[PDB]
Amino acid sequence: VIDIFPTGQTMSFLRLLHGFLGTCRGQSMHQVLRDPCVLRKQLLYGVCKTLFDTITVRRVAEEWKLHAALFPYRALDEEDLEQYLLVWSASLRQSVQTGVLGALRDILYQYADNDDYGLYVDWCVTVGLVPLLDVKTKPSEAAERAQFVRAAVQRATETHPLAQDLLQANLALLLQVAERLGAVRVANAPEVRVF
Amino acid sequence: VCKTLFDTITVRRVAEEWKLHAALFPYRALDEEDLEQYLLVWSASLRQSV
Amino acid sequence: AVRKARDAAPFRPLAVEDNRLVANSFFSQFVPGTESLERFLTQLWENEYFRTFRLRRLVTHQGAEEAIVYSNYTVERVTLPYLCHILALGTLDPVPEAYLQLSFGEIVAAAYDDSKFCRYVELICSREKARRRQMSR
Amino acid sequence: RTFRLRRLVTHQGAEEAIVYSNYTVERVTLPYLCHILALGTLDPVPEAYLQLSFGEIVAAAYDDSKFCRYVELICSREKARRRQMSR
Amino acid sequence: KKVRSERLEAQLRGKHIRLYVAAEPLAYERDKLLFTTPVAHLHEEILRYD
Structure with a gap:
């Protein structure tokens, strides 16, 4: 029966988080972790570690032969090829860099709400009892996710013929993250209370 | 825009420029020395012009 | 001018009628210390904007501060959301922090090394030197 | 002391921007990932890899993935197939 | 700012x-808003200066 949130204590407990009554020079110390777009830089590493781990040798070894026989003819077995391979490493890494870059900058900033995290870090340091909201997902709510994964291919095809195959291979994780991340919210409601 | 601008180009367009420029004026003198030096200057002289 | 000032702010006394001539007096010379917390508010702004957007400073020996540049974090935090919902989406990549300080003319050279075209001119310089390396044997 | 945020101090002790640690990104950011967001797939970024660019972070995970160790295998296998042709 | 939906x-x-x-x-309790912007954090103190 004990009220927690809309009581006389917890209201001023949250007004003091911003500059309502008291402000010293270090109230911005909370602000350096109040910021969003660090969760984006965390989930970027959390997906990209999985993104380069679903590929075997056989798929990428064939790229070697296709590229090797597309234009060059080996001149020196131990010299031309070694040097060519050496440049070939960075030229595949940079092209799959920009490939996954085009594959991720589109989908993060369309789907990740910014301040659903700052309201979180304004709650967990403050109460520890963070409420959270959901949503029933209509087909219109999942439609744009189903089309924008189809729009993710065009930003990857022109820089890489494999990064299309990699997103086609790793489409399962992208549909798994695009159904839960924007489905949950944290309520900034006027009339809310924890019990 | 320039990162996307320098990534939709293949070898075949720019490699023909090599042969055209190479035979436009110079005649190869040494296969292992003259060409390498020519190649070396040939990098920055296309990079500055693009 | 001194005379002018003398008569420009005339000697105006102060008085209140009282039934009795009773008066016990004091004086309060005072200023407030505006300097002591201006130098707190100036180093408040600087200790706020370096926590929101974390702007990089370039300090030299004997700790002297120079001009302050954007980070790699803030350009992602305020410019990229200007790019994703105000401008064209899904093609432009964010610039590194040091490349942001770098010249407007030199950025094409810094992206030239970061593109395939350096790795094409390394390919053409090594493949056509290799066709002319084996020409000696 | 709660979240142990790392400071970047230079010569003659001048403070620079203050970054997250490796400790706090698992304590406050990660339960928001594994109990509010999608579960059981994501890894915490290192602290020095958090200061780094938004673009080169995938190249820093490129070294930590298998593709450097596949491109080294391919560059040593097809060099080795063209090493024994001389002898 | 709407209060109904x-x-x-x-x-x-x-x-x-x-x-x-x-x-x-x-948006919290009744008929009032709170702002997490950086300027509202020092809004009263910069009014304290004048």
Whole structure:
């Protein structure tokens, strides 16, 4: 029966988080972790570690032969090829860099709400009892996710013929993250209370 | 825009420029020395012009 | 001018009628210390904007501060959301922090090394030197 | 002391921007990932890899993935197939 | 700002117009808003200066 949130204590407990009554020079110390777009830089590493781990040798070894026989003819077995391979490493890494870059900058900033995290870090340091909201997902709510994964291919095809195959291979994780991340919210409601 | 601008180009367009420029004026003198030096200057002289 | 000032702010006394001539007096010379917390508010702004957007400073020996540049974090935090919902989406990549300080003319050279075209001119310089390396044997 | 945020101090002790640690990104950011967001797939970024660019972070995970160790295998296998042709 | 099915609309010339949230306010208890912007943090203190 004990009220927690809309009581006389917890209201001023949250007004003091911003500059309502008291402000010293270090109230911005909370602000350096109040910021969003660090969760984006965390989930970027959390997906990209999985993104380069679903590929075997056989798929990428064939790229070697296709590229090797597309234009060059080996001149020196131990010299031309070694040097060519050496440049070939960075030229595949940079092209799959920009490939996954085009594959991720589109989908993060369309789907990740910014301040659903700052309201979180304004709650967990403050109460520890963070409420959270959901949503029933209509087909219109999942439609744009189903089309924008189809729009993710065009930003990857022109820089890489494999990064299309990699997103086609790793489409399962992208549909798994695009159904839960924007489905949950944290309520900034006027009339809310924890019990 | 320039990162996307320098990534939709293949070898075949720019490699023909090599042969055209190479035979436009110079005649190869040494296969292992003259060409390498020519190649070396040939990098920055296309990079500055693009 | 001194005379002018003398008569420009005339000697105006102060008085209140009282039934009795009773008066016990004091004086309060005072200023407030505006300097002591201006130098707190100036180093408040600087200790706020370096926590929101974390702007990089370039300090030299004997700790002297120079001009302050954007980070790699803030350009992602305020410019990229200007790019994703105000401008064209899904093609432009964010610039590194040091490349942001770098010249407007030199950025094409810094992206030239970061593109395939350096790795094409390394390919053409090594493949056509290799066709002319084996020409000696 | 709660979240142990790392400071970047230079010569003659001048403070620079203050970054997250490796400790706090698992304590406050990660339960928001594994109990509010999608579960059981994501890894915490290192602290020095958090200061780094938004673009080169995938190249820093490129070294930590298998593709450097596949491109080294391919560059040593097809060099080795063209090493024994001389002898 | 709507209170019935709460929303953020923008008005111009008696017409709706697109905006977007970047530092959206802490709508709380009754008839009041709270702002997580950096300037509202020192709004009273910079009024304290004058």
